[PDB]
């Protein structure tokens, strides 16, 4: 179990940690989140009471360092920082616990939700999508655009998701125009999996990371990326069986966790109806199809 202490809470903010969230009042004595499960990535995120635009937060992994939060009154936001003095950090964490000023990561033992949402997400791959190599943790917010979005402006602040484009030379072999456009198997298996991602776990990890950024920050380019990676698989006639079964589990838990009120902007009608009902893999997502129909039959 690990801890992320907070120096203070000067402004009223809703704090999230993974799928959980707490309201903290201006200058409320709040000093951190304890009992954070080791072994997974985590995201701590913020939405100020005064600005319900710009949700923002930090992906991190406690195995990589001692991290803490501090409000910056110049930049006006809660910043994550690393403490290199291991003794000074245990000292702060112990004194704040002694004073019981820390919330406990509220995990139910039966619950594998966070594991299921982050199964393939690795901190080292996050840091290649959010490039800021002086920090071990990664900032994401509602407004950050992706590299593909930038192509159709500040590269330091971009989400470097892998570019997927069904009408590109990369996706379409000369002489196999019709075959490759209607059956993206080549694009998925040779170009993307063997070429770029190297294996299905890295692919699933980016897909899961894209979903979580869309859910937690309403990041629109992330939502586009999540749907593109689903569509690429579903529009491929030849997919490893282990990938289809794992995709069905991944999507089930994503749909399960989504806020009902957000299904309108977070779920692309065309992609889902094509994947569930038209695509090569219409019959391979039984759990995902069953939960989509019982929870969002309108979208379909």
């Amino acid at each position: 179990m690990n801890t992320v202490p907070f120096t203070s809470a000067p402004i009223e903010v809703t704090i999230g940690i993974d799928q959980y969230s707490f309201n903290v009042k201006e200058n409320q004595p709040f000093h951190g989140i304890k009992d954070i499960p080791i072994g997974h990535v985590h995201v701590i995120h913020f939405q100020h009471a005064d600005n319900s635009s710009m949700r923002y937060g930090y992906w991190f992994d406690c195995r990589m360092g001692n991290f803490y939060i501090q409000y910056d009154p110049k930049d006006g936001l809660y910043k994550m920082m690393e403490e290199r003095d291991g003794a000074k950090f245990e000292n702060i964490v112990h004194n704040f616990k002694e004073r019981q000023m820390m919330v406990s990561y509220p995990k139910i033992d039966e619950d594998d939700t966070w594991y299921n949402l982050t199964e393939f997400v690795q901190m080292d791959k996050i840091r290649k999508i959010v490039r800021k190599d002086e920090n071990q943790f990664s900032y994401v917010d509602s407004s950050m655009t992706t590299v593909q979005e930038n192509e159709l402006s500040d590269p330091a602040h971009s989400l470097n998701y892998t570019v997927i484009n069904f009408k590109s030379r990369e996706a379409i072999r000369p002489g196999h125009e019709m075959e490759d456009f209607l059956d993206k198997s080549y694009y998925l298996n040779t170009v993307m999996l063997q070429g770029i991602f190297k294996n299905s776990s890295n692919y699933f990890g980016e897909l899961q990371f894209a979903f979580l950024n869309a859910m937690f920050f309403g990041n629109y380019g992330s939502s586009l990326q999540w749907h593109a990676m689903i569509e690429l698989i579903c529009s491929s006639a030849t997919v490893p069986k282990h990938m289809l079964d794992k995709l069905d589990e991944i999507l089930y838990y994503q749909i399960k966790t989504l806020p009902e009120q957000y299904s309108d902007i977070l779920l692309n009608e065309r992609v889902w109806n094509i994947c569930l009902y038209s695509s090569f893999q219409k019959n391979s997502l039984h759990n995902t199809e069953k939960i989509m129909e019982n929870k969002y039959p309108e979208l379909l």
Binding site: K167, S168, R169, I172, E177, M178, F181
Partner: protein
């Protein structure tokens, strides 16, 4: 963007552009089998690729052999269309390649776009106009070269005959679409109008009769009358 009544004069500027109509690429007759089931028999078709400014028509004949042993032929026809249009552009010198290709049916956009990936600066555009290019096989000389073909073949025509020696592209295109609209709505009456008078002949190297200017006025009015009559009939107006 899409082409509509508003941006209609763009067709006659000096940016090279082609219309592609795929409506006659995959043509079948439907018949009964011995067992009483229904079957199709393909006949020869054509891609209708037209430069509306110059009248140059690239009639690519689609021989029935193309379909041999293929499934989902109506879908394949769209990709074959795009393959052939793309090969046509490749065959043209750079300074003759179009800057835009306007497809008459929106289903052609993705196939042509994919086939044209090598030409990113050629814009593939849909249209909202209800162009009558399907009636191209009502033009006797075009129907004849298509049906006689024994193999894939490209045949070039000027669909405006020599009209451009006397009228502008805009007017030439209006006449062509009027003639074709009429042929589409009532082929027999349209063809009667065009050929009634035996003294007005079709040059060997033309598609339409050699009307004088005044006779074209009379023809065009007769085609207008035809089209309005048929409309009244269709809707009981």
């Amino acid at each position: 963007g899409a082409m509509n009544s508003s941006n209609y004069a763009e067709l006659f500027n000096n940016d090279i552009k082609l219309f592609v109509d795929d409506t006659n690429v995959y043509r079948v007759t439907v018949h009964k089998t011995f067992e009483g089931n229904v079957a199709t028999k393909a006949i020869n078709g054509c891609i209708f690729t037209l430069n509306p400014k110059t009248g140059h028509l690239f009639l690519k004949i689609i021989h029935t052999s193309v379909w041999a042993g293929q499934k989902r032929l109506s879908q394949l026809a769209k990709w074959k269309t795009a393959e052939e249009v793309s090969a046509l552009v490749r065959s043209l010198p750079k300074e003759e390649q179009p800057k835009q290709i306007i497809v008459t049916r929106k289903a052609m956009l993705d196939p042509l776009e994919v086939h044209m990936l090598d030409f990113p600066n050629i814009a593939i555009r849909p249209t909202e106009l209800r162009l009558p290019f399907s009636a191209a096989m009502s033009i006797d000389k075009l129907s004849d070269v298509v049906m006689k073909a024994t193999e894939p073949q490209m045949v070039l025509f000027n669909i405006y005959d020599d009209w451009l020696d006397r009228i502008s592209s805009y007017t030439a295109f209006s006449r062509l679409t009027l003639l074709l609209r009429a042929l589409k709505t009532n082929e027999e009456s349209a063809k009667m109008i065009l050929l009634s008078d035996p003294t007005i002949t079709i040059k060997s190297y033309h598609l339409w009769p050699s009307f004088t200017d005044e006779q074209w006025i009379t023809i065009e009015s007769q085609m207008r009358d035809l089209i309005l009559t048929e409309y009244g009939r269709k809707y009981n107006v």
